Amino acid sequence: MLQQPTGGYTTLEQFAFTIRNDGTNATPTQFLQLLSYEATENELVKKTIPTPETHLPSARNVPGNVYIEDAITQALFGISAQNVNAHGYFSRLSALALPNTSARLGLDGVIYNSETINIPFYDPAAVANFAATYAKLGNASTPRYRADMIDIYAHVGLELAGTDAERAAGVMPVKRAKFDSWEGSLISLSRDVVNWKILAFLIDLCSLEGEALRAFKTRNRDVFRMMLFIMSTAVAANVVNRKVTKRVDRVLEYIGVNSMRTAGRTATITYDLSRHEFAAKFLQLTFTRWN
Amino acid sequence: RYHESVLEIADIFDQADFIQTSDAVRQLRALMPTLSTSQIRHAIERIAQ
Amino acid sequence: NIAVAHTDHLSVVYATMSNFMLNFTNNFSGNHATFKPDQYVITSPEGSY
């Protein structure tokens, strides 16, 4: 029954987000330094983000317990081909949104009906606010509710590849980002970033207050710029790798502009139609909370 | 409460024709053992032969 | 031609059968606008459902 000192569960060594590359294991901060980019002249301008709709879906009665956490990641950064998922037990979340409920949310990423014996879980009070915002992710494919899978991506590219000199004006030149690679590359970061404990992050966003939110956003603006990069190569138009003499570069076509089908096919992670609606519903919901 | 019972079409709605209103036969009618649609059918059947 | 033998001999059948030894739950439906089963569950604090 862990608690947060307002440092948050992210101020802990229990679960930390680390990519493995370079023959040893490294933190996200060290990785991003390799991403160097130029310009190709198609101005990607920051639009406004429309507020979400308050209505929460109903968690249709369900016996047993689903791994609510699993699906959140298994859709966003899921590597292995994921079939249609617009359907599913994806809104049991809202059953935590009400005041007095007994249903608890454990560590590891499960949603128990009744707290059982020997299972460590997040604090029942700070998991409430996380739900009154993310249980709203249940209606991701209901017509007349789904977000728009175009404009948010403009917001995304201004984040992982936008030098501050640009974001302070709200406009930037479309970039083509290439870092140096190894073998599997793009697919390897996916099989890696999947098992990260995303819930250990999102809970902090909706609780931690201005004192420990300005400090929280400063140490974690990088764990965000990591699960935002992989989520981006699932959109880019090309992945062709340039060649030096012995070196290899993974030029990525157009980060921040959204096409409709993956450049990866075989080389990188791939999305599906049912997932395009999903990524837009996540990316929209999370940005208001972050920004 | 209110003591609930049954009314009559025999009282309200009297017409010299179409509603047979003779109390001598009202006395006659208040004797039979509650007819159905089958009891009255066999009545207009025994009277035939 | 049915209603008489349907709301008398068959009516007293349910009237008695409503209160048998074994029957225990309420399956009442005199208001289709609002009625729910109000089910119970056998649960232990040590992981059982």
CB nearest A117 (choices: C43, C46, C49): C46
The alpha-carbon gap from C12 to the nearest alpha carbon of chain B, in Å, equals 17
SS3 at position C48? strand
- For B30, counting Cβ atoms within 10 Å of its Cβ (0-12 exposed, 13-18 middle, 19+ buried), the class is exposed
Looking up tokens 């089958």 gives: B38
Asked if the Cβ–Cβ distance from C49 to A116 is below 8 Å, we say: no
Which amino acid would we find at residue A230? I
Enumerate residues 1 to 49 of chain C having a beta carbon within 8 A of any beta carbon in chain A: 43, 45-47, 49
Looking up tokens 């003591």 gives: B3
Whether A114 and C43 have beta carbons less than 8 Å apart is answered as yes
User: Comparing C-alpha atoms, which of A160, A154, A167, A184 is closest to residue A257?
Assistant: A154
Q: Quote the tokens at residue A92.
A: 């049991």
Neighbours of chain A (3+ CB pairs under 8 A): C
Residue B33 with chain C: CB contacts under 8 Å: none
Residue C5 with chain B: CB contacts under 8 Å: 36
User: Comparing C-alpha atoms, which of A270, A188, A251 is closest to residue A22?
Assistant: A188
- CA of A118: how far to CAs of A4, A81, A106, in Å? 20, 34, 10
Q: Give the phi and the psi of residue A24 in degrees, each rounded to 5.
A: -145, 170
Neighbours of chain C (3+ CB pairs under 8 A): A, B
The alpha-carbon gap from A112 to the nearest alpha carbon of chain C, in Å, equals 9
Enumerate residues 58 to 97 of chain A having a beta carbon within 8 A of any beta carbon in chain C: 63-64
The alpha-carbon gap from A258 to the nearest alpha carbon of chain C, in Å, equals 46
CB atoms within 10 A of CB B29: 12
- CA of A70: how far to CAs of A40, A73, A83, A104, A108, in Å? 38, 6, 15, 16, 9
Mark A45-55 as b/e (b = at least 16 C-beta within 10 Å).
Answer: ebeebeebeee
Q: Give the phi and the psi of residue A233 in degrees, each rounded to 5.
A: -70, -5
C-alpha of A37 from chain center: 22
Distance CA A153, CA A159 (A): 10
Distance CA A76, CA A199 (A): 13
Give resolution, Å, one decimal.
Answer: 4.1
Helix and strand counts by DSSP (H, E) for chain B:
2, 0
Residues in a beta bridge with A194: none
Distance CA B30, CA B28 (A): 6
Measured over the CA atoms of residue A9, residue A15, residue A21 and residue A26, the dihedral's sign is: positive
Distance CA A267, CA A98 (A): 44
Q: Quote the tokens at residue C25.
A: 């739950």
Mark A110-120 as b/e (b = at least 16 C-beta within 10 Å).
Answer: bbebebbeeee
Asked if the Cβ–Cβ distance from A63 to C49 is below 8 Å, we say: yes
Q: Specify the DSSP element, H or E, that contains A45.
A: strand A36-45
Q: Specify the DSSP element, H or E, that contains A19.
A: strand A19-21
Distance CA A273, CA B5 (A): 70
| A144 Cβ contact list (under 8 Å, min separation 6) | none
Q: Give the phi and the psi of residue A288 in degrees, each rounded to 5.
A: -60, -40
SS3 at position B21? coil
- CA of A7: how far to CAs of A28, A124, A209, in Å? 20, 17, 10
Residue C1 with chain B: CB contacts under 8 Å: 37-38
SS3 at position A148? coil
Whether A150 and A235 have beta carbons less than 8 Å apart is answered as no
Q: Specify the DSSP element, H or E, that contains A20.
A: strand A19-21
CB atoms within 10 A of CB A289: 13
Distance CA A116, CA C41 (A): 16
Distance CA A162, CA A45 (A): 12
SS3 at position A137? helix
CA closest to C1 among chain B residues:
B37
Q: Quote the tokens at residue A228.
A: 């935002």
DSSP string over A212-250: HHHTHHHHSTTTTTTTTTHHHHTT-S--PPPB-SS-BB-
Asked if the Cβ–Cβ distance from C49 to A117 is below 8 Å, we say: no
Whether A22 and A192 have beta carbons less than 8 Å apart is answered as no
User: Comparing C-alpha atoms, which of A217, A252, A206 is closest to residue A93?
Assistant: A206
- For A101, counting Cβ atoms within 10 Å of its Cβ (0-12 exposed, 13-18 middle, 19+ buried), the class is middle
User: Comparing C-alpha atoms, which of A197, A229, A160 is closest to residue A73?
Assistant: A197
| A22 Cβ contact list (under 8 Å, min separation 6) | none
The alpha-carbon gap from C18 to the nearest alpha carbon of chain B, in Å, equals 26
Q: Give the phi and the psi of residue A231 in degrees, each rounded to 5.
A: -60, -15
User: Comparing C-alpha atoms, which of A79, A176, A97 is closest to residue A134?
Assistant: A97
CA closest to C8 among chain B residues:
B36
Whether A and B touch (3+ CB pairs < 8 Å), yes or no: no
CA closest to C4 among chain B residues:
B36
Distance CA A84, CA A82 (A): 7
CA closest to B38 among chain C residues:
C1
SS3 at position C28? coil
- For A84, counting Cβ atoms within 10 Å of its Cβ (0-12 exposed, 13-18 middle, 19+ buried), the class is exposed
| A207 Cβ contact list (under 8 Å, min separation 6) | A4, A8, A126, A129, A130
User: Comparing C-alpha atoms, which of A175, A185, A144 is closest to residue A254?
Assistant: A175
Residues in a beta bridge with A178: A36
Measured over the CA atoms of residue A34, residue A40, residue A41 and residue A45, the dihedral's sign is: negative
CA closest to C41 among chain A residues:
A63
Enumerate residues 1 to 30 of chain C having a beta carbon within 8 A of any beta carbon in chain B: 1, 4-5
- Residue among B38, B41, B42 with most chain C CBs within 10 A, to mutate: B38
Largest CA distance in chain C: 61
